[PDB]
Amino acid sequence: MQSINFRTARGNLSEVLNNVEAGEEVEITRRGREPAVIVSKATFEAYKKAALDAE
């Protein structure tokens, strides 16, 4: 699941990364605070990398 509150993220990070590796983009939302996204490093490094232009 790609939406997970703060309490559900830390309370279960073990499973959280397991499914990230697998690899879901998991979103860690907090009460009043901006939303986050935990995605596998391997993958974001590629999102980031494609960011290329114009070479």
Domain boundaries, the chain: 1-55
50: exposed, middle or buried (Cβ count in 10 Å: 0-12, 13-18, 19+): exposed
Nearest-angstrom CA–CA distance, 43 and 30: 24
- The pair of three-digit structure tokens given for residue 30, joined into one six-digit string: 């907090």
CATH of 1-55, one of 3.60.150.10, 3.40.1620.10, 2.60.40.10, 3.10.350.10: 3.40.1620.10
Which whole-number Å values give the CA distances from 19 to 25, 46, 52, in the listed order? 8, 18, 28
Specify the residue for token string 């907090």: 30
Nearest-angstrom CA–CA distance, 25 and 22: 9
27: left (phi over 0), alpha (psi -120 to 50) or beta: beta
* Eight-class DSSP state of 34: P
What resolution does the deposited structure have, in angstroms?
Answer: 2.2
Closest CA to 16 of 34, 31, 38: 38
What is the H or E stretch that residue 15 is in?
A: helix 13-20
Nearest-angstrom CA–CA distance, 23 and 26: 9
